[PDB]
Amino acid sequence: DPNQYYKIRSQAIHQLKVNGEDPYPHKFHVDISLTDFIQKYSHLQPGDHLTDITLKVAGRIHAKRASGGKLIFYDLRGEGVKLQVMANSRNYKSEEEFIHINNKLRRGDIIGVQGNPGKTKKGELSIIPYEITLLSPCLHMLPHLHFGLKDKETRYRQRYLDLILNDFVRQKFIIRSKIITYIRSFLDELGFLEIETPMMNIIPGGAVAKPFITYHNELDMNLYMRIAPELYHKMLVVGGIDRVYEIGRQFRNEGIDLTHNPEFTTCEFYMAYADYHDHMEITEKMVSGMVKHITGSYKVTYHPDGPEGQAYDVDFTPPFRRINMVEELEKALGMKLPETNLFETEETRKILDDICVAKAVECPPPRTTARLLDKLVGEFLEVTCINPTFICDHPQIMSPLAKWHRSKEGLTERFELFVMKKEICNAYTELNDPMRQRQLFEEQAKAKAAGDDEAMFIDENFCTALEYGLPPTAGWGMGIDRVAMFLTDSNNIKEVLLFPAMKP
Amino acid sequence: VDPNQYYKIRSQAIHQLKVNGEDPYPHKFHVDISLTDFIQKYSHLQPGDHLTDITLKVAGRIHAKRASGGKLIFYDLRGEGVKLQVMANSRNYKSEEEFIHINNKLRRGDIIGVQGNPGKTKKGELSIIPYEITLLSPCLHMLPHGLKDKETRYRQRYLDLILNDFVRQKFIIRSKIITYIRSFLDELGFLEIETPMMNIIPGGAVAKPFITYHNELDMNLYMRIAPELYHKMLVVGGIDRVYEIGRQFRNEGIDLTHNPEFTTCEFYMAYADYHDHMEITEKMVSGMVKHITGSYKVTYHPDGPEGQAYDVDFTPPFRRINMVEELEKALGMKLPETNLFETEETRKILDDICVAKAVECPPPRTTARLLDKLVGEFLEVTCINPTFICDHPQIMSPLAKWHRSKEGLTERFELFVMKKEICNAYTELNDPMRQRQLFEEQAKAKAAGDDEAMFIDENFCTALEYGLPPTAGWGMGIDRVAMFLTDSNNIKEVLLFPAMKP
Ligand SMILES: NCCCC[C@H](N)C(=O)NS(=O)(=O)OC[C@H]1O[C@@H](n2cnc3c(N)ncnc32)[C@H](O)[C@@H]1O
Ligand SMILES: NCCCC[C@H](N)C(=O)NS(=O)(=O)OC[C@H]1O[C@@H](n2cnc3c(N)ncnc32)[C@H](O)[C@@H]1O
Structure with missing residues (x-):
């Protein structure tokens, strides 16, 4: 299974290159670190969504759990810290691009996220994306979540x-x-x-x-x-x-x-x-x-x-x-x-x-x-x-x-x-x-x-x-x-x- | 003298000190003050001063040794990128007999420890007037006269x-x-x-x-x-x-x-x-x-x-x-x-x-x-x-x-x-x-x-x-x-x- 994952994903990434969708872009401007993001917005309450504020963050996807057709959750990690990406279709740049980017992302990918601070009803500090950009894809299966390394x-x-x-x-x-x-x-x-x-x-x-x-x-x-x-x-x-x-x-x-x-x-x-x-x-x-x-x-x-x-x-x-x-x-x-x-x-x-x-x-x-x-x-x-x-x-x-x-x-x-x-x-x-x-x-x-x-x-x-x-x-x-x-x-x-x- | 003969002559003298129990490489010398701190603490004195109140111990390498008659020797003590003069006077040394003994054995390049009083020459050189000089490490070679x-x-x-x-x-x-x-x-x-x-x-x-x-x-x-x-x-x-x-x-x-x-x-x-x-x-x-x-x-x-x-x-x-x-x-x-x-x-x-x-x-x-x-x-x-x-x-x-x-x-x-x-x-x-x-x-x-x-x-x-x-x-x-x-x-x-x- 891990061997087939590497071949399939290596094929997918190569197809992106020839489709002019550079999966390894040169520069992504990060506005705020994940650590500074949490300390700056941890105070928010469940349901909040600051439409006034738009920042850009980056990190590695540790998990991708979808809920419906219009909503996917990404476990974004970096700097020894974690932040949740609540990707909603109605908040994304467009419905067509929302379906396109989520089909391309996998666990382990490096992504950049432009969006608004928010907090889910469950009480997780989150980033509500307007646009997600794949920065560097992970071509391998990483150790499973139950027991790891x-x-x-x-x-x-x-x-x-x-x-x-x-x-x-x-x-x-x-x-x-x-x-x-x-x-x-x-x-x-x-x-x-x-x-x-x-x-x-x-x-x-x-x-x-x-x-x-x-x-x-x-x-x-x-x-x-x-x-x-x-x-x-x-x-x-x-x-x-x-x-x-x-x-x-x-x-x-x-x-x-x-x-x-x-x-x-x-x-x-x-x-x-x-x-x-x-x-x-x-x-x-x-x-x-x-x-x-x-x-x-x-x-x-x-x-x-x-x-x-x-x-x-x-x-x-x-x-x-x-x-x-x-x-x-x-x-x-x-x-x-x-x-x-x-x-x-x-x-x-x-x-x-x-x-x-x-x-x-x-x-x-x-x-x-x-x-x-x-x-x-x-x-x-x-x-x-x-x-x-x-x-x-x-x-x-x-x-x-x-x-x-x-x-x-x-x-x-x-x-x-x-x-x-x-x-x-x-x-x-x-x-x-x-x-x-x-x-x-x-x-x-x-x-x-x-x-x-x-x-x-x-x-x-x-x-x-x-x-x-x-x-x-x-x-x-x-x-x-x-x-x-x-x-x-x-x-x-x-x-x-x-x-x-x-x-x- | 030839550098090779200088090396043999000094090595022999040092060896004679060893077998006679004179310890030319002593284990520990307690330094009271660094040369740098000595200069900043005592540059303020005036030409001719000689403080009987203060007795410190310093150390360094002899860069020059010029005699002034036999009862007075000047040593150029260097270390820490800084310089201090040792005005070795016969009447101020531990004894007249030990003054002749220590000065005859010391050479340019030696590491020495000096216990004495701060002072200033009439010309205005800050100096230490030693009561006792101790050889800490001899230099067995001729150093370049530059380099x-x-x-x-x-x-x-x-x-x-x-x-x-x-x-x-x-x-x-x-x-x-x-x-x-x-x-x-x-x-x-x-x-x-x-x-x-x-x-x-x-x-x-x-x-x-x-x-x-x-x-x-x-x-x-x-x-x-x-x-x-x-x-x-x-x-x-x-x-x-x-x-x-x-x-x-x-x-x-x-x-x-x-x-x-x-x-x-x-x-x-x-x-x-x-x-x-x-x-x-x-x-x-x-x-x-x-x-x-x-x-x-x-x-x-x-x-x-x-x-x-x-x-x-x-x-x-x-x-x-x-x-x-x-x-x-x-x-x-x-x-x-x-x-x-x-x-x-x-x-x-x-x-x-x-x-x-x-x-x-x-x-x-x-x-x-x-x-x-x-x-x-x-x-x-x-x-x-x-x-x-x-x-x-x-x-x-x-x-x-x-x-x-x-x-x-x-x-x-x-x-x-x-x-x-x-x-x-x-x-x-x-x-x-x-x-x-x-x-x-x-x-x-x-x-x-x-x-x-x-x-x-x-x-x-x-x-x-x-x-x-x-x-x-x-x-x-x-x-x-x-x-x-x-x-x-x-x-x-x-x-x-x-x-x-x-
Ligand atoms: N990721 C960007 C490049 C990182 C540096 C890369 N690993 C590298 O080795 N560059 S280097 O040109 O080969 O050496 C770096 C610098 O080390 C210096 N240097 C290099 N070789 C020597 C040698 N032989 N002697 C003395 N100094 C040297 C020199 O100023 C170089 O600019
Ligand atoms: N002048 C007084 C002695 C100064 C240090 C002396 N030159 C010296 O080498 N001492 S040592 O025992 O051989 O190494 C110093 C320390 O390095 C550590 N060490 C030594 N060997 C190894 C090795 N193989 N692997 C990892 N760490 C090591 C170890 O804790 C030593 O106490």
Whole structure:
């Protein structure tokens, strides 16, 4: 049936073209939006019909229900709003044209309506047409009215169908766009300069991740899509721009799940003369201010198991709870780990390997200390973070760009913010010692030769830039898509991306 | 001393500080007041003043170090695009012994923190008289004594930003351009959106794409050449006004107006045509210039600082010209009628004209590419003032709607400012059957050698079959705007890290 509808209607539209009835006209002058139309005329009473007033509106027909031969009702929708078109024969331009236009219209068509405001006897605000014009015909059958567009696959591969039929979808992407606008306002007020840095790199850096590779024909050159803008931003602080930020796309050649898309949006900012303690206060102020400004409360209802699951109230009232990674993991495991100045030994790596096997937490090769630690932290600590929680003082061996902790040997001045069991922020006091930064780069290169696809390349250009003097600096990064996730009560990142990445 | 030996000497000294526990890279320095706020708060003092009442802490980079006998040193402290003098006096320092110790280790380029009192030299220089100077980050290299070489400026942009304050102003202007556009469109009800930068099939422009591969999904992907197709699908979805400031990627050569990655603004407006967008462009571009510059006039130096200067007036209305007629005027010849611009005889006529007028066109010598070369040689070079070039032939606009009076042409315009293309906009083609036919012609051109021809996007065609309302779209090169608002003839001047040959 849907296949035959498409052929029949495609035939009808083609006949209109050759009949000189252009079904795709160039311009239709809209006098008033549907939203402004309702707020301007909702006050009317049943039976009213303002003959004095004539406006032109436009939208998509969601339903067409005829009653007699001289009267048809059209469900006109647009802007997330609805308006009824009460097409009467005696009010139309002519009786012959009234029969002609109604024979041509179908559900799904884009039409323009010129007429008078009115209200039906049943109490529906309506537009009484003098002339209806077909603007763009719909050649397909749209999902039936009883049950419409629930399958996840079609909603994500035809997002325009999702937006036409489900008005909860358009509200999520308004929220997501309100989140980003809030960030810019927050940082612009603080004197940060919004900058743009290359997304194609001779050598990628700024995170531990597998990159996408590409090739430039003219330069006969292999390039990588950026995994993070971190290194370029620190070069800007060397250049004397003490506060920079950038909201931009990152690309990571990794697997898709409920919180990972191969391309995603982050905000990174860098502030001269601040440390990671300063960024804990800024993070609290920004996240809490943003949740309250978007939702309307400092509390967010969160459904980990879908609508028919448990509901958890997440409180974003500062200050957020802080836990030290290694110290709290000793508590969660119920055993003492080697002291932090021993984390580079092989005896320590096999201790953490044994713990992973004993507690069944699982780790694909290479089974590095840093990777085993990350798996243990995810299993025992990150799952307990429902409320916004800072996990602090990461070991140096998992933080190649973070400055060493000023009191705790083996650790760094780093924190991550976790909300509703997922990582939201990553920030630390920046390592500005160029000699120590080279040593950590050369260790990353050995890890890569030892199997880690995510280990960092040696970036000698960046090390040279640090030799010109980077002031004491603290940086910060946040996954915007994950923020939109917990602010729209979405457990699937595909819900907050307009066109998520999909298998063919 | 040699720069290489300077680097070795200073690296050794710094390393000696590290192993002796002297911490040349301290973790945190509490700054009490910014240099800018220090100057406005204390510019009012009089020559000779020295306030014992006030003790603040500032920080910055040493740009100069001139001794005045041994008990007095002057430091030129810079930061935030501003300057402040540090009058290091021996009798005012923490101790005479520490005064000699800190000044002997400090060099030009170092990041330092200064705790002291505000003051003013007898000559009238606002100064801070330090009680204690702290080294925050040493500079291990010799900085240029200026820095005018273009290759070094573009490969070490941090050196450019430290030494040249006209560079820092250009990038402040660029961010003011982007912030202005967002304010302009947000006020008009546009929703800022994000659309995929990795595509199964690239589209929305005529360009050669970058190719990549996703391992887990075992899939070849392309970096986007434009977001146009995704935006129109959102208009089908009922979001009547969308826009996006984002990066585009084009596998082509670098020149004075082309970078392989660049930033554009694209917006799409339901129920508007390209006539509506010409007025929006006038309002936005003129308003943007005046809010940034302060007037509607911008000085333009096509031949560098030592060349002629032209005052470019951005007061609306902008001049409008029709592409084909003005190209016929420049050529001194009549072209075939516009309804013949897709025939092979017309391509052969344009081919002959290109050789006769010595305008080169690398293969394939298609009508669209020969026309593009002719427009670049004869029309686009004469556009100094903001100029609309309108009504492009359909064969150069596979996504633009046909012109309602002139068959063979489209409802399209481009904005040219100071010899550069700035905007591209047209009434969107929303006939799905006609859009498919033009996709099939582009596909044959690709099989005929054009790597820049468009792929057939059946997903987009399917979306057009659900009904795209009459719509007009618009695209602006952000980097190209920053070029003519900073009087830059080289796009590398308005990119923080431009693409360079290795
Ligand atoms: N200078 C301090 C660190 C600054 C940020 C640092 N350069 C960085 O890249 N940190 S990150 O953990 O690798 O990414 C930052 C956030 O992006 C989010 N994100 C990360 N990977 C993905 C993926 N694959 N998909 C979607 N969202 C993601 C996530 O919430 C991170 O907290
Ligand atoms: N729907 C109407 C058309 C919308 C815009 C369309 N998607 C498009 O891509 N137009 S474009 O001509 O191909 O690019 C838009 C602008 O980007 C600028 N630009 C284009 N290519 C480059 C390159 N290589 N480098 C730097 N800047 C560039 C240039 O000013 C263009 O006017």
